[PDB]
Structures are given as C-alpha cells and as structure tokens.
Chain A
Amino acid sequence: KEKSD
C-alpha cells in the first residue's frame, strides 16, 4: 500500500 517500506 502507501507506506509499505
């Protein structure tokens, strides 16, 4: 999704 890292 958006902030996966």
Chain B
Amino acid sequence: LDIKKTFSNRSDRVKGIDFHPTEPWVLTTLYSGRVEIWNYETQVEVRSIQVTETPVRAGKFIARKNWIIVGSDDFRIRVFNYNTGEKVVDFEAHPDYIRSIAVHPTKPYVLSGSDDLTVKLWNWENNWALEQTFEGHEHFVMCVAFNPKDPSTFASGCLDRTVKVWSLGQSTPNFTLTTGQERGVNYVDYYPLPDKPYMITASDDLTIKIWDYQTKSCVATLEGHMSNVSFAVFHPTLPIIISGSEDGTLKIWNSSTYKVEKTLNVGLERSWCIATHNYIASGFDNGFTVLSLG
C-alpha cells in the first residue's frame, strides 16, 4: 500500500463517479447538473455537459456503446455519446429522484433505483423499453448493483434497513437481508471473486457490514468512521475494502482481518461516491480525487 495522488480537481459536489475500462478517464456527475469526463493521466477534460439544472446523482460508462448514462433529480435518465457529445435518449424513468444506476456486463440492460421505492429494468436494444419493475422496498432505493459472478441477479440497498437480492424475470426477492443498520442502507456492493459469497453494506449508523449471501449472516462489522458512511466496496484485485464517509475521510480496511489500514483525509469535505478500475477514485463536496495504490 503505497498510495499516490494521481489527479485531484475542485468542482461542485460530486455525487456519481465511474472509471472507463480502457481509456484513462473518470466520469463525475455533479449536484449542479453538470457531468465531467477527465483524462486523469494528462489532466485535461475529454468532455463536459450541462445535462440539467438539478443534481445528477448517478452516472456510468457504457463502454461497449461509447455512452455515458446518467440519472438526475429531475426524474430523467439521459444517455450521451461521449465521442460526439450528442444526447441519444432522454426519458422520465421514475416519478421521483434517481439514486443509482447499474449496467449489465453482457446484456443491453440498465437498472435504476429511485425514491419511488422501486428498481426498474430498461433494455436499450428494445428502444429503452421498461422491461420490469421490482416492487417491495419500503423507503428510497439508494444503491443497485449486479452480481458480477451471476448478473442474472442483483442487489438493492434501501433506507428501509434492508438489502433485497432479485432475479431478473421474477417479481419477488430471492431473499431480503435484515441489516440491523437501523438508519438505513446507503450502499451495497459485491465481492468480485469466486472464493467468497460476500456483499457489503454502508449505513448512516456509522457501520459497514460484510454479508454471506448464501447463509444471510453478518461476517464482520467495520467501525471507525465518525459520520454517515456513504459507500463501502471490495477492491477488485487488492485484498482491501475501501469506504468513504461524511466525516471527510476515505478508509482502507484489511479484507482478511477487517481492521483499518489507512485513513485518508483528502481535504475535499464529505465523501459521496466511489469507483475502482490499482486506481480508485472518489467524489466529494468540493471535487474528486484519483488515487493509485500499486
């Protein structure tokens, strides 16, 4: 763990962030309605768009289509071609805020999680048709993520203090995880490797929890953040967990011992979002930062 500072820049509050898989680019989506795509090696903006006047809380690359997809508090999903800058689709996806967007790794599917208490599946090869609504949660759906080892299933994290895991094509959850994080679930992520059936959740109750999704048990609890924990993720290649919080810090936890290894206060106020490519990137109140670990 030699943490090197690749590229930071100040901006309005960064609510979403994503790495491009083949280009050295980071996408940020801002509370001001702007999105930015930065080449973090050369430190030049590849493209910027004033998408709306409302916060844009969710954004992802869809690399195989040369798109970004974003979702904003104006209720709308929009898709832009990052090479030409042109908007390719623009539709009202939910009658409320869009918190989270996930892209299926091999099929033309996108999920959106909303304050309307639902997750919705859209198919871009079927004219962006609504293919299914997953109803069940009792509060805002804050995060949605496919299972990378089985993307026919996905998890939703919700302020109703639960995580629900669903199968595409089925109306009810495969199971519902009672987190015990009584201030709600802000984020949910899968561990990517096949040796552990692990998921991780972050909460305003200052805890981070690891879950065995076969037995539905809590494997460990990571404590130490001083304020709401906005996200927690497994690193794809390093045996570490990365979290960020409104206490202004990133924390890197040992993924074997579940103990904190490093606490980074990057000086940009509250942390809100995370991406991993050993690059990681995080979005904050006052900008973003791209960090190399090895």
Contacts and interface: CB of A to CB of B under 8 A. Distances in A.
Contacts, number: 12
B55 to A, nearest CB: 9
A1 B140 CA distance: 11
Contacts of B115: 1
Interface residues of B, number: 10
A2 to B, nearest CB: 7
Contacts of A1: 115
A1 B142 CA distance: 14
B268 interface: no
Interface centre among A1, A2, A3, A5 (most CB of B within 10 A): A3
* Interface majority SS (helix, strand, loop, mixed), chain B: loop
B275 interface: no
Interface size for chain A: under 10, 10 to 19, 20 to 34, or 35 or more residues? under 10
Nearest to B228: A3
Nearest to B204: A3
Contact of A3 (B13, B31, B159, B270): B159
Contacts of A5: 13, 31, 270
A1 B115 CA distance: 10
Nearest to A3: B140
Contacts of B99: 3
Contacts of B139: 2
Contact of A2 (B13, B31, B159): B159
A5 B142 CA distance: 13
The 5 closest A-B pairs by CB, nearest first: A3-B140, A2-B140, A2-B159, A3-B142, A3-B159
Given A2-B140, A2-B159, A5-B270, 6 more contacts: A1-B115, A2-B139, A3-B140, A3-B142, A3-B159, A3-B186
5 contacts: A2-B140, A3-B99, A3-B140, A3-B142, A5-B13
